[PDB]
A = this chain, B = another copy of it.
Amino acid sequence: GLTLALSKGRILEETMPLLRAAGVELLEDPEASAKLIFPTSNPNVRVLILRASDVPTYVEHGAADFGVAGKDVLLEHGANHVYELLDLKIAQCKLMTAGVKDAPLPNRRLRIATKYVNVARAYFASQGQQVDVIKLYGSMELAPLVGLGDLIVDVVDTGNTLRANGLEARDHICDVSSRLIVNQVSYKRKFALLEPILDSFKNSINS
């Protein structure tokens, strides 16, 4: 059958309506289980629950035939060995730069504190800046408060996180939504299983 890689929180929550419309429901709540492999109402489809970071890794190697990944994670991971088939328009946010509100930029090479080191470098390169990048894994909004780095790059949605910590978004880098990715082989070998799920999602997202 098909293995679908998802992640907890917004992607699991916001994907389920798309799955339900396509004839696929989980038989329990993965948020409440230690389990990581879940059957569905469709015995041709099961689900993996992974860290957001690992969804492309699983789909690339074909541990999963397909997954739902944030565009931020694909941009950072590189998506050269998976096919991006659909923009699902869920878990919508922005990649942004940010700093202490009204904090002047220092006139030296910039230090960007981010999980998204490759996106930070590419974005600053497009703005004419070779920056240094301090790699972190969470709570990017702490970095500028303690003077770790001049700016951060992170996902902004409401901007509540930035505002609460006295930060403000400086640049918008790009819009981020979750994307349906397929294993390059799975697409060739199990398309008959993928296709009616792809067509259902495509129709669902139009609404």
Contact = CB atoms under 8 A, between A and B. Distances in A.
User: How many copies of this chain sit in the oligomeric assembly?
Assistant: 2
Contacts of A135: 57
Interface in A138-194: 138-139, 141-143, 145-148, 164
Contacts of A51: 136-139
A146 B54 contact: no
Interface in A8-39: 34, 36-37
A146 B138 CA distance: 28
A141 B34 CA distance: 11
A66 interface: no
Interface of A: 3, 34, 36-37, 48-51, 53-54, 57-58, 61, 63-64, 134-139, 141-143, 145-148, 164
A116 to B, nearest CB: 14
Given A34-B164, A63-B146, A148-B63, A139 B50 contact: yes
A158 to B, nearest CB: 14
A51 B143 CA distance: 12
Contacts of A148: 57-58, 61, 63
Given A57-B134, A61-B134, A134-B61, A37 B145 contact: yes
- Most interface-central of A49, A51, A58, A148 (chain B CB within 10 A): A148
B143 A63 contact: yes
Contacts of A134: 57, 61
